[PDB]
Amino acid sequence: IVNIGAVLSTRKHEQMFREAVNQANKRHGSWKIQLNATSVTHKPNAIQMALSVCEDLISSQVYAILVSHPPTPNDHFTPTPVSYTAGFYRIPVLGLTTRMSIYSDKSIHLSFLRTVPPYSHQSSVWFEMMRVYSWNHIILLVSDDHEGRAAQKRLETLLEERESKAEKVLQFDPGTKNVTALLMEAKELEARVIILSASEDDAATVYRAAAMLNMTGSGYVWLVGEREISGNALRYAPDGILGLQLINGKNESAHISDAVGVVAQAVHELLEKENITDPPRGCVGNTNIWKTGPLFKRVLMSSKYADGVTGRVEFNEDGDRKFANYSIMNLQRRKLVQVGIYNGTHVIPNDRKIIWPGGETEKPRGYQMSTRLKIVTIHQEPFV
């Protein structure tokens, strides 16, 4: 027999997980392979959470772990204690609603999988949308963190293939409320884009700069991610900005079903192999990982199952996701309405209406020429 534990938020989610695992067991042949699941709730103290999760799940000899973000607002502490504790061995952990760029460095987290587009897909879809707008004057504001640097690097490596000059870049630092010199730097330029990569409320600060440097209107479109249009940043924002957001975002039951289906497929694929051991139990008396640890992760990367709730749930080399979906809206007098549908190099935007943060409709052509020349010379009697 085998078991697949998980860490969920509420008891209703636990009941949904039980129903999903029962349905999965009802499927397939279920010959000599039974998977009864166990669940556990969250805790305020991270130390208590880590100790409890190891002593509970590890002692049960699980074969996979599912972790989801708790219902508490903001923050990102959801996977870090579980990922660190279960990262001692090579038991894979599946993410459910955790979209952060810190969990992409395989050197730090050596065993972590999820089915949610990191924020590299944010810059990828940014490049995909910008390839057709025909501006070639990319300038963006980036917060000095892991997410902002990752987004800027993804933009640079997306433009490296196209061989285009991305003007300049602005770095407004994290945790600041007085940013206007960067706005003056971006004031004089032929780059008519105000692409923004900030950290929530920080954007709000530079948003106030938009109300202070009077650059908004008849040009200077804005491009922000899903996290920049939530909270105060959404409230202290001007209309006409493109409300990019990731679409079935706050939905987990469908994601739970997809995860359990792909886990069952991977387990069935792995069962037909050579001798297989079991992960140790106790959290105390074992200091060695089992032999075929990374083998399960490797066979899990190459597991494709495009029949659960949505399209092809394909895992790339990084392990985040492939072929997901994106719904880019716009702040047209608030009430964001989807205008762009994205699924990977195959954008089919909605033709509802296009409005820019200048009260107009026509796309602001981002070009300036200037005939201001700056001759310089040294004196020379017959000529100068």
Epitope: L234, R235, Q332, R333, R334, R352, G359, E360, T361
Partner: antibody, heavy 117, light 109 residues
Framework: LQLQESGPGLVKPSQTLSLTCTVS?????????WSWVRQPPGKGLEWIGE???????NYNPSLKSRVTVSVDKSKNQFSLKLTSVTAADTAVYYC?????????????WGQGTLVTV | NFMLTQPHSVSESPGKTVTISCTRS????????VQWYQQRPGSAPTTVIY?????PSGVPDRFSGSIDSSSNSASLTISGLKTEDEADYYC?????????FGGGTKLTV
């Protein structure tokens, strides 16, 4: 800019009202919206929809397939149509354009039109 | 979508301070803006408070508005009540889905 709202005057049961809110002293060609405020008798106030010249309009998620608003710039006019208006749709319609500012703000408020279905 | 709650009725002597509280049951009214309108009997409503920090030009300086920021409620304070203040007070707010208006409160002199 002033708004003069005159309705069809017919309030028979199972009918659709289309009030004409003419604009005097102003031009339709602008970046402003024009929203309708629905006031039931002896109750509160709610917003049922709005019109904006350059394209899409958001009436309401509750009655998206029930209220349709169109605008003609040449006549400086804009009309609404409530699809399948029930006998309980007897209220007062007010046409207020907008305030730009940074968020929605209805000012000034027109005299509106009165319908008793 | 959400709802806003207002007191049924209030009574205060003229020349005193009258406080009207409009509470938001769902969510938190701390980032988006709220406004206070006033309706006369038989006339179109007129705004009295916007942006919770100033008043429209020509409005009396007695009217003031503030946000509790603790109980998700907006407080409108009028000092020096007068007979001309007899009207209907409404609280209006907006969100990312729809725009809602308060039930309304009436003060009796």
């Amino acid at each position: 800019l002033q708004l003069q709202e005159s309705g069809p005057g017919l309030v028979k049961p199972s009918q659709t009202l289309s009030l004409t809110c003419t604009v005097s002293g102003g031009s339709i060609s602008s970046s402003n919206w024009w929203s309708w405020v629905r006031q039931p008798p002896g109750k509160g106030l709610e917003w049922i929809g709005e019109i904006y010249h350059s394209g899409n309009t958001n009436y309401n998620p509750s009655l998206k397939s029930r209220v349709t608003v169109s605008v003609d710039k040449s006549k400086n006019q804009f009309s609404l149509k409530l699809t399948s208006v029930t006998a309980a749709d007897t209220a007062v319609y007010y046409c207020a354009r907008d305030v730009s500012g940074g968020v929605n703000w209805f000012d000034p408020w027109g005299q509106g039109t009165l319908v008793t279905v | 979508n959400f709802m806003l709650t207002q007191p049924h009725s209030v009574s205060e002597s003229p020349g005193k301070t009258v406080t009207i509280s409009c509470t938001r049951s769902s969510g938190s009214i701390a980032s988006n803006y709220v406004q206070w309108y006033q309706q006369r009997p038989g006339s179109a409503p007129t705004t009295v408070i916007y942006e919770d920090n100033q008043r429209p030009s020509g409005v009396p300086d007695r009217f003031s508005g503030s946000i509790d920021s603790s109980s998700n409620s907006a407080s409108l304070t009028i000092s020096g009540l007068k007979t001309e203040d007899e009207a209907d007070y409404y609280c209006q707010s907006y969100d990312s889905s729809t725009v809602v208006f308060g039930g309304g409160t009436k003060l009796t002199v």
